[PDB]
Every structure is written in C-alpha cells, then in structure tokens.
Design a protein around this nucleic acid. Structure first.
Lengths: 272, 102, 86, 56
RNA sequence: UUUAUUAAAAACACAGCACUCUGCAAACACGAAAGUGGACGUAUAGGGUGUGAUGCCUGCCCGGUGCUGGAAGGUUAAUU
RNA sequence: GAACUGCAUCUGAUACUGUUGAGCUAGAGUAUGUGAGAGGAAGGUAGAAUUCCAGGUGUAGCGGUGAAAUGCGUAGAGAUCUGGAGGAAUACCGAUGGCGAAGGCAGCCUUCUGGCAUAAUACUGACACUGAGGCUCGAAAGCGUGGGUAGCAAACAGGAUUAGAUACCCUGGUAGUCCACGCCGUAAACGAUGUCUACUAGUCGUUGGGUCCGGACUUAGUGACGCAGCUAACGCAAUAAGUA
C-alpha cells in the first residue's frame, strides 16, 4: 500500500512510498544476475540520444523468463522479490527438477503456490498458456507478439489485458492503451494482472528521489535561447509558436506512428 | 447442503452430454457427496434463442455436497463452454421424486 | 454461525444446574461465543452495518448480564470473566 | 399445496398471452402463493422454459 | 542550480499537475548505412510540450493559425 | 401571647421510600422446533430497451413543437434486417403488500450474516424503563483519490416565445448520477405526533403465524371507519391527540 511520510522535513512532506512487507528482504538469486552498467543515455557514437538519463543507483539485471518454455514441469514460488529493473515484482520459481527462474509476479500470486506452463494448465495466476487455450474474458498479462519470442506486452506493474474474442488464428485483445488488436492464437499469455498495482499511486516527494532513479533534470524549451530550441527567445515569458520538440516536431496532437507492415494487426483505438 | 443444478448444453454436444454428467458425478461422489436425483429432459425447445440456437439439452441433477466441491462444480460449468446455461439452487431437503418435465 | 452441537457444548460447560440454559453464566458464555464467531464475518464485511447493529446489541446484553451477575454474586462474576477472558 | 418452476404447464395459465405475469386481482391467488409463483416464473424465464416477452 | 573572470536572483531546476504522442523492429534520438541509445524496458512504460509544493480553484471564444477525423464535389504531378 | 414554616439530640411507629437476608414468577431474557420477508454485505448472471460502431435493403426526408426553428440527412439520414461494444436500471408480478431503529430496501442465483413472528416445554429469577453528556448509523446534493461513462442531466451553447426571457418549451451538452475507499452529517430526515408501560364501546379489510370445528377464536403488524373522552377548531379516537 501507500504510506505517507510525516512532514518532518520539507523534502519529506510529500513522500508517499509504496510498501510491500511480503517481499524478500535478502539478496536475489545470484545465478540469475547479470552486471549492467549505466548508459547515460548515450549510444555507440557517445552521443546523447535519450535525454535526462544519468546517475542513479548501481543495479544488477535479473534474468526474467519471459518465454516460459519449461512446460509440464510444475514450479513452486520460492519468493517474491523487488526488482530495480522494472516496476513489477518478480517471483523466484523453483521447478520440480530444481531449476530456478525469475518470472513477472502476478498480483494474486503468493509464496508457495504452484505455477504451470504449457497448454494443459489450470487457469490460475502465473500459469503460461497459448492464447487459444485461455477462455475469453480472462484477464491476462505478459503477451507474446511473435510465436516463441517471449512476452513483450502487459509487463509493467498492474498491467492487464482483456481477451475479448477470436477470429480465425487471431485473438482479439484490448490493451490498457485503449487499443484493440490482433495477436496470433499460438502466442502465449500468463493468467492474471501484474503485481504492484499501486505503483502509480506513489509520490517521489523531492528532486533527489528522481535523481536516485537515474533521471536528470528537464529544461523547458521556452527557457532557452532560439539557437537551442524553437521555443527559445523572447523578452520575458512568451511562447510564440505552435508547441514542438527541440527537433521541430509538433507535440500537441500530431500523430507519429509510421508502420505499414503491422497496420493490419490493429482493430481499432478508443476515443476519449 | 443439498443443491439442485440444471444444466443447459449445446445440441452439438448432446453426444458428450452423458460423459460430462458422469464426470460431474465422479467429482461429487469422490468428495463424499451424495447424488440424489439425476434426470435428463432431452432436447427441449428454448422459448427464446440462446447464442443463436433454438434447441438445447436439459439435464437436472439434484446433488448434495459441500461448498468447496460446489465451487469446483461451478468453475467446471463456467469453463465447459458446452453448457450454455446453469441454474444452481439450494434446497432445504433432498428431492428424489420424478420431476414434471420427465 | 454456531451449530446446535457447539451451542450445546457451551451450555453443558457452563451449566449451573441441570439443563438450565438460562442462567447468566450460560447466557454470557453463549453471547461470548457468538460475538467471537461473528468477528470472522465482520472482518470480511466491514460495511455490514445492519448486522453490526445486532452484534452491538449482543455486546450490550452481555454487559447487562455481567453487571447483574457481579451485583448478585461477585465470586461467580470473577470466575466467569476469568474463564471467558473478559 | 406447492408450486415449483418445473410446473411449466401450471405456470402457463398464470402467464399472459405476451409473457407478462397475471395479477392477483385477476387470477385470485393468495399473496403468498402469488409471491412464490412470481419467483418460479422468473426462474423459468431464466432457464428459457417460458418466454420473457412474446417478441424476442 | 546559474552568467569560470562586474548579474546568485523574482532567473533555471524541483517533487506535483495536464495535454499529446508511442502496441514494440515503439514513438523519439545519433548515424550515409550498418550499428546503436530508448531498453535486455513494454502504455502503472517510454518520448515531447506547458505548468510548477500545497489550499481554494481554473470562466467565455474553434472566426485566424495548427492538430484530429471525413471525402461529396472542385483543382491538381510524373506518366500515358 | 402567637409565630419564627428552621436546626440539633434523644424516644417511639413501620404504611411508603432508602439499606439489607431469603424466596416467587407476572416484567425482561435463554435453549429447542417451524415460518415469512425489496433486512444487510460480497460475488456471479439473464432478458427487454437505449446509445454507439460496422455492414445489407432503400430513398428524401427525419426529428421536434401549440406552431416553429436550431439539429440530423443526398458524404445516403430516418425506417428495416444482421452482427459487435458498453453502461445503467430491473417492465409485468406490485398489493393504505412486506422487511428494516430511522435513513432506507425490488430481475434471478450462490456465499456470509442481523432482526422478527410463532408452538410447547424447560430454565434465569427484577437481570427493568428512560437517558444529560458520549458514541454509532444517517436521503439527496456536495467533496477527495482512483475507475467507469449507455441514458438522463446542473452549468453551458444554440433555436424559439417575449417589450425583455440570464426561464418555462426545443435541439444538444459537461459535472453529477454508477463503482472502490474515505469525508460530509444536513432534509417538509413528517405521522410536522420522543421512548416505554397499563387501562378504556365497537365494526369492516389486509400481511405472517397458531388452535379448533368452508367458517370461528386468538396473536404480531398494517389500514378504513366509529362511541365515550379529549380538542380553539380542524380533528384524534386500542397504531389516541383518551385515562394515568
């Protein structure tokens, strides 16, 4: 849940932290860990290609099983861990043969219960099934897009997908983006929504807390000079022009998708 | 606790309407439950179309079980997809007399 | 709820006399069992105010009987509340 | 004596021509049996033994 | 935090708010391309824009210029 | 002289009040069997209808009003048929009917759960009533946060009407109405009638029981009348506004 801090400092007055007593207090499983150095948002040219990235805490990469190809071998949930690489919690799975993996933890997934992968699996949270074997109207997460590639959609904390129906070899999914789209029925999904549903209820409180997460400050275009940004310039405060990015692309309403090879997968979008 | 459950199954699955009935019987009786009545009203004609069909198979079995097996049964009915309707009622006593629809 | 069997178990445990089922001891014990059992219901149904009204009446009746029993015989009252953890 | 939702042939003479429940001021039934009859009719309507309306 | 070396501020940033884009080979950015960053992340995410704790709040105008949707009609390139 | 209604201390009486010992069952409760119910809470589900989306038929209107107009429609509406999405409410039953302390509570099913009504027996043995403060609950609107959003609709936009029309009427329409969790604590929250007792002509309905022989009696409600009595009058009248 969400815990307010007492206003014992002005940097604490608006801290509302997400607290989970039930997640592991110890260190992650060492064999599923990879080193991961920060990038600063710089590509192989050493250029900033993504702004406001830098600093923050050193973190290891947890290797997540997004594919779930250990079918028909049951696993038990050893522990539910915090992951610094995502907003969702992760579950350490312990298979019958003793192999250990990490998966995205579902909300209704506790330590001790048994998870299954494959086509003859119960419709319980954490089980991975092909979309043709999941009853319509089941709330799912961790959606595969290409067959065998692993989950790409509905992975963030609290993420759920409505499985609306079917047309041929396609499952019709309503995503939390307000988007109805086709996915091949041989692609897999995991039952239930994703854990850490109150991720979006948190309040960082102070600028240093955003710095701890590797985010550098953001400087509005209107505060620049015209040589830096289309919004720069002016005696005093002034906008003057249609809002746009520093590269001159409009930022209020202009659509930017340009992908014809996937355009047939998309039923529709919602209007609000 | 005595329950009277009426199942409403697709006519395209009337051949397996027997097999699912025995599966439910086995599930109820393997949890120390009792099955007091088991009728079969056959291919009745619906008074209004359900899921575009006008005829469907009716099976009423008055069983006696507990809450956990009742939940298992209800989930089975939900996921069968051959059952197009289910009515689970609670009865104070056990009913074994032949119904008026058979 | 409480079954007939466990209600009779409480009655038998707190019988002052033979098959009395009406003394302050058995009344307070039965009310105590019912309240402690209804705690389970009201932990899952917090907004059940219409049921909570009756549970509050149970609490009030048990308090009335405990005060009456204390004023009648103090040894019996101090024994009863010690048995029931009150 | 007793009334059930599987007495569809009995419920027919207490339903109207267009599927509406006939009132007690017409049928003459007691309040208690009228309540039971309404419940049984609603259950039969759910089980599709009786029509809700006459034009579905 | 800032005009290294005449300006430290009411300027910038800030937690928070809103709009808008983006279904993943994402949008976006570097690059001639390959290859990258975004991110071994996945819409509770990521980008852009404005505003700037909090409290009470945030009226009217879609004519202009943008943006979004529409295509009946008018006009309209190479080509032929 | 009377009085100074007063106070104090002794003595006497025990009807009543106070304090006490014992006992009793008629007030108040308990156990046991049946019964009715839109009582409450959490889930699920059904069918009619609206709205929207996409198609088929089809063509020149639809819609609306006291009349109109705004609006929608030749980019093909409205109508008709077929599919899909979604939200909300639950026609008939339905009833001065029921349940709830009030506020309130209607499709159906399950789970959890409160009270009541009723028969008899056994039991406790005054355990009672009321209640300042206190606490709890408490329509609708409203507020916070997060969802949802079909219909309706404050605000708002337009069209009419009008001298004007910040309205009534019309076409639209956002908050809200719906959900979760918290506030708010107010209503003509009314029976404008505090709660709880006992007693006082009667007549006719109705809901849930019970006992007898289709009726009779009795119970707890819920209604219409109507004596005595009460009332300024209106009226109330065993569900009192009568008698205490």
């Amino acid at each position: 849940p969400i815990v307010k801090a007492k206003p014992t400092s002005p940097g604490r007055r608006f801290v509302e932290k997400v607290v989970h007593p039930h997640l592991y207090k110890g260190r992650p499983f060492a064999a599923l860990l990879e080193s991961k150095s920060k990038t600063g948002g710089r590509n192989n040219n050493g250029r900033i290609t993504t702004r406001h990235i830098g600093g923050g805490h050193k973190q290891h990469y947890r290797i997540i099983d997004f594919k779930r190809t250990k079918d028909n071998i049951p696993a038990t949930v050893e522990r539910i861990e915090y992951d610094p690489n995502r907003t969702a919690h992760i579950a350490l799975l312990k298979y019958a043969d003793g192999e250990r993996r990490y998966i995205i933890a579902a909300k209704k997934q506790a330590v001790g219960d048994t998870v299954m992968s494959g086509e003859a699996s119960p419709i319980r949270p954490g089980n991975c099934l092909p979309l043709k074997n999941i009853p319509l109207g089941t709330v799912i997460h961790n959606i595969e897009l290409k067959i065998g590639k692993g989950a790409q959609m509905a992975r963030a904390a609290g993420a759920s997908v409505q499985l609306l129906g079917r047309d041929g070899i396609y499952a019709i999914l309503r995503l939390r983006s307000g988007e109805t789209r086709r996915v091949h029925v041989n692609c897999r999904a995991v039952i239930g929504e994703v854990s850490n549903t109150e991720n979006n209820l948190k309040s960082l409180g102070k600028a240093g807390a955003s710095r701890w997460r590797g985010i550098r400050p953001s400087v509005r275009g209107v505060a620049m000079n015209p040589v830096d940004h289309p919004h720069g310039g002016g005696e005093g405060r002034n906008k003057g022009r249609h809002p746009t990015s520093p590269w001159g692309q409009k930022s209020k309403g202009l659509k930017t998708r340009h992908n014809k090879r996937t355009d047939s997968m998309i039923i529709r979008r919602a209007k609000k | 606790r005595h329950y009277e459950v009426v199942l409403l199954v697709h006519p395209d699955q009337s051949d397996q309407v027997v097999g699912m009935v025995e599966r439910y019987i086995k599930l109820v009786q393997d949890n120390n439950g009792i099955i007091h009545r088991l009728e079969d009203w056959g291919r009745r004609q619906l008074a209004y179309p359900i899921n575009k069909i006008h005829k469907a198979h009716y099976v009423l079995f008055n069983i006696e079980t507990n809450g956990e097996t009742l939940a298992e049964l209800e989930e089975l009915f939900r996921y069968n997809d051959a059952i197009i309707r289910s009515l689970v009622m609670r009865r104070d006593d056990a009913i074994t007399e032949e119904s008026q629809l058979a | 709820m409480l079954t007939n069997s466990d209600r009779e178990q409480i009655i038998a445990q707190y019988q002052r006399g033979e098959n009395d089922t009406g003394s302050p001891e058995v009344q307070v014990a039965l009310l105590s069992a019912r309240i402690n059992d209804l705690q389970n219901h009201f932990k899952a149904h917090k907004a059940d105010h219409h049921s909570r009204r009756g549970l509050i009446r149970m609490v009030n009746t048990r308090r009335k009987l405990l005060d009456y029993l204390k004023g009648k015989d103090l040894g019996r009252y101090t024994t009863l509340i010690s048995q029931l953890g009150l | 004596t007793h009334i059930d939702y599987k007495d569809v042939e009995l419920l027919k003479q207490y339903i109207s021509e267009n599927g509406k429940i006939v009132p007690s001021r017409i049928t003459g039934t007691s309040t208690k049996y009228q309540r039971q009859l309404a419940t049984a009719i609603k259950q039969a309507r759910y089980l599709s033994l009786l029509p809700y309306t006459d034009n579905h």
